[PDB]
Design a protein around this ligand. Structure first.
Ligand SMILES: [Ca+2]
Ligand SMILES: [Ca+2]
Ligand SMILES: [Ca+2]
Ligand SMILES: [Ca+2]
Ligand SMILES: [Cl-]
Ligand SMILES: [Cl-]
Ligand SMILES: [Mg+2]
Ligand SMILES: [Mg+2]
Ligand SMILES: [Mg+2]
Ligand SMILES: [Mg+2]
Lengths: 10, 236, 236, 10
């Protein structure tokens, strides 16, 4: 399980 | 460029349409065309640019991982020789991915970053520069890997320094930047302790500033804070 | 063609890799290259060809629907004039979709169908011919719409006649063909009663032949039968 | 809700 980066959001 | 004959406003309008249609390659081409008009980008326009290319490269990264995994398994002892096709096709996807990264980095260098003077635009672009070098780093093998990693680190660091001076700890750009720099540390730079420390400090400083925010800003900030927490759970 | 220098077996191998990576445009290009080698396709190869192009055109159809809906709403009374961009971009997606359909129809005509002598290959290809004319029909406006509809109908009908003569009622190709011809009737040809009758008869005749099948064949047939039933529920 | 056509399957 890879780390979460910033998703699409403003 | 193929978008040179289209009005800037039309390119932005069509980028928004492409987003609705989940046509992210088109969305990226339209936003590239918009950038190449030479005017600075608004906040909304910066976000369109980011969404478009993130989705394109996201597809490529997911594909590259699939192919790289197959390739690694072919190179285990006891695996039947299947010829050059897996490597060839992984290389093809990799090249396309590097091309997309180079395109984004090119736009940032010509000339988005140099014209960006406000903290919100400059940090946004420098974070992007870090991100796309990070994506290059994911597929890089050797000493050129080192220079790519250092390029990512340098961009993130410049962005961090500005964000810390110029933005509140709850600013979503600042939070997203810290999140992604923490991912860099953990996933790319072999520095899990740096990753954890950054995520923890970022989370704690944001927590302490939440009281200043409206309900809507609070929702925006806490969304990203939760991702920091999700990573800390994964990492510890 | 760009795949002219690659071995047929390599093209098939890479098509399978592209499928695993969810790179359907690549998968389609590789299978196109394979077809253009001039040899007939096996059952598995026919299925790779079908999956690849179905996924490509599926993306385009979904996008076209989004854009067409936006366009229709712009043309309602009380809607603010937004210029030509919506129509232009819908037209762009539409053209690309028609191009994909034309490519598939070209492969079938040059020369897959004419070399297909067994019922399983000939019905498969004729169903595809019906399907890609149906996709053209979805976006067609006017009298050329009529000739496109008739082309779809003709291909489906030829496929049906062969399937009824040569295949058991539970054959998945036969079932899938009848399913899609029923969708043609309902969605394209303004013939819901024909659609319902076909779906009902197909379902009932398959039900009565299930007893002849292995557990695995039974699972394959009943999967498609359930789709006939889902449509009948939607339609009645 | 559009009619269901044949999915990707053998
Ligand atoms: Ca091989
Ligand atoms: Ca400026
Ligand atoms: Ca306009
Ligand atoms: Ca033959
Ligand atoms: Cl390749
Ligand atoms: Cl357009
Ligand atoms: Mg062996
Ligand atoms: Mg390489
Ligand atoms: Mg008005
Ligand atoms: Mg047209």
């Amino acid at each position: 399980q890879r780390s979460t980066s910033t998703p699409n959001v403003h | 460029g193929a978008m040179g004959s289209m009005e800037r406003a039309s390119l932005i309008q069509k980028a928004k349409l492409a987003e609705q249609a989940e046509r992210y390659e088109d969305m990226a081409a339209f936003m590239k065309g918009a950038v190449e008009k030479g005017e600075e980008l608004s906040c909304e326009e910066r976000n369109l640019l980011s969404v478009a290319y993130k989705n394109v490269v996201g597809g490529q990264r997911a594909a590259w991982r699939v192919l790289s995994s197959i390739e690694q398994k072919s190179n285990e002892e006891g695996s039947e020789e299947k010829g050059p096709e897996v490597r060839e096709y992984r290389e093809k996807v990799e090249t396309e991915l590097q091309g997309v990264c180079d395109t984004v980095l090119g736009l940032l260098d010509s000339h988005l970053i140099k014209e960006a003077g406000d903290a919100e635009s400059r940090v946004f672009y420098l974070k992007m520069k870090g991100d796309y070098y990070r994506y290059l780093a994911e597929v890089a093998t050797g000493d050129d890997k080192k220079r790519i990693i250092d390029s990512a680190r340098s961009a993130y660091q410049e962005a961090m320094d500005i964000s810390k001076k110029e933005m509140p700890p709850t600013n979503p750009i600042r939070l997203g930047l810290a999140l992604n720099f923490s991912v860099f540390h953990y996933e790319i730079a072999n520095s899990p302790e740096e990753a954890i420390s950054l995520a923890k400090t970022t989370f704690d400083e944001a927590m302490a500033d939440l009281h200043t925010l409206s309900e809507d800003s609070y929702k925006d900030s806490t969304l990203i804070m939760q991702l920091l927490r999700d990573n800390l759970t994964l990492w510890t």
